[PDB]
Amino acid sequence: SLRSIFWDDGLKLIDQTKLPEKLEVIECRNVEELADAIKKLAVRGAPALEAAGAYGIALAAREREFADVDELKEHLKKAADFLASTRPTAVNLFVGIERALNAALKGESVEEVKELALREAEKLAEEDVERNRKMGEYGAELLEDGDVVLTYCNAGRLATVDWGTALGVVRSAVEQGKEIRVIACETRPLNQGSRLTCWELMEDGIDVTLITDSMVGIVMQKGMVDKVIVGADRIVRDAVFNKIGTYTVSVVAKHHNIPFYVAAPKATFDWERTAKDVVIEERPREELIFCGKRQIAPLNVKVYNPAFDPTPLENVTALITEYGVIYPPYEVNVPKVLKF
């Protein structure tokens, strides 16, 4: 399969806005194109965005030819500024941008700056893949042959450079020859579960059954789920922030004594904070009013559309990271395992 974003004679990305109907690889030949790809969510997922930020700098340095280095460098600082502005709050996009820029600026000739930019970006993408496979191997130990895994949103290979976090754990277990099947929640209101998760799993030959988010209750009630594995957008000392709905799934799983796992790398932890420090942004109200171009609600209806919810760590059986599986008490084990 393809990595979600990579370099092959230029910046290439899987155009996720085209899924699930068509697999389309697009080419970003300039700063603006990548930026809009980022805006349209053609590229998404923290690692994917980090790699986008880094390849962005390699791209900006190759955009057009340069006779003088200092002019090249000046341009990179501008491009870095422009790309990060696509969303100032994207920590990963910021990390990718600054790491690639920092490295490229270390060059003393036009070629050096060009090669160093690309080399740092390729290294960062490679490290994300390695991190997910390592995390996957650790997580696979929590899966048994015949297990049915319920997941939420899309913490897979489209959201990372490759392999995935939560779905990376499923891929690692399948690789070990364990028969694993997945139940995926459609994940309203943007349907990342039906559009993306079902696509990447079917593409890779992993059994998947699609259900509405609200069906999480009946499937556990019927004993159709052995474990839940979700990803995370941010992990603070008392909670896991992930795509809205995750907390709901955690409540049903807890009541049914179903193991609930969160797969996320060390970089997703923000251990100096607690849930009270986090502000949850509201997403566009139209995501609940129209579906495709079909109006599904009165045009002027009031909408509450939070982007994420906090799942208390009390509802998390274990955290699966590239440093290993972490169990409660998290206050003790998170610092220990992540080597804070």
- Binding site: residue ranges? 44-46, 87, 192, 242-243
Closer residue to its own copies, CB minimum distance, 300 or 339: 300
Nearest to 160 by CA among 198, 128, 199: 128
Q: Which stretch binds its own copies (CB under 8 A): 55-63, 123-131, 179-187, 320-328?
A: 179-187
Angstrom distance (rounded) from CA 340 to CA 335 = 5
Closer residue to its own copies, CB minimum distance, 68 or 286: 286
Helix, strand, or coil (residue 240)? strand
278 binds its own copies (CB under 8 A): no
Residue list, annotated binding site for substrate? 44-46, 87, 192, 242-243
Helix, strand, or coil (residue 153)? coil
Helix, strand, or coil (residue 297)? coil
Can you read off the two tokens belonging to residue 306?
Answer: 């939070």
Q: Which stretch binds its own copies (CB under 8 A): 5-13, 87-95, 100-108, 282-290?
A: 282-290
Task: List residues bridging with 324 in a β-sheet.
Answer: 321
293 binds its own copies (CB under 8 A): yes
233 given a catalytic annotation: yes
Q: How far is the CB of 167 from its own copies (least distance, A)?
A: 15
Closer residue to its own copies, CB minimum distance, 89 or 300: 300
255 binds its own copies (CB under 8 A): yes
300 binds its own copies (CB under 8 A): yes
Angstrom distance (rounded) from CA 113 to CA 117 = 6
Q: Which stretch binds its own copies (CB under 8 A): 46-54, 56-64, 138-146, 299-307?
A: 299-307
Nearest to 166 by CA among 231, 220, 98: 231
Contacts with 92 (C-beta within 8 Å, 6 or more apart), sequence order: 46, 47, 49, 50, 53, 267
Q: How far is the CB of 151 from its own copies (least distance, A)?
A: 14
Number of Cβ atoms within 10 Å of the Cβ of 118: 22
Angstrom distance (rounded) from CA 206 to CA 200 = 9
Q: How many residues bind its own copies (CB under 8 A)?
A: 58
Of residues 305 through 324, those in contact with its own copies by CB under 8 A are: 305-306, 309-310
Of 65, 89, 294, 339, the residue at the interface with its own copies (CB under 8 A) is 294
Contacts with 117 (C-beta within 8 Å, 6 or more apart), sequence order: 57, 58, 60, 61, 76, 100, 101, 103, 104, 107
198 binds its own copies (CB under 8 A): yes
Q: Which of 15, 204, 226, 233 is catalytic?
A: 233
Task: List residues bridging with 291 in a β-sheet.
Answer: 294
Q: How far is the CB of 319 from its own copies (least distance, A)?
A: 20
State phi, psi for 150 to the nearest 5 degrees.
-90, 135
167 binds its own copies (CB under 8 A): no
CB 69 within 8 A of CB 110: yes
Number of Cβ atoms within 10 Å of the Cβ of 179: 12
Of 67, 177, 302, 339, the residue at the interface with its own copies (CB under 8 A) is 302
Q: How far is the CB of 200 from its own copies (least distance, A)?
A: 10
Nearest to 5 by CA among 64, 53, 61, 63: 53
In the shown chain, the binding pattern of residues 204 to 223 toward its own copies, with x for contact by CB under 8 A and - for none, equals: ---xxxxxxxxxxxxx-x--
Closer residue to its own copies, CB minimum distance, 2 or 224: 224
- Residues tagged active-site: 233
| Interacting residue ranges for its own copies, rule: CB under 8 A | 20-21, 183, 185-189, 191, 194-195, 198-199, 202, 207-219, 221, 224, 244-245, 247-252, 255, 288-298, 300-306, 309-310
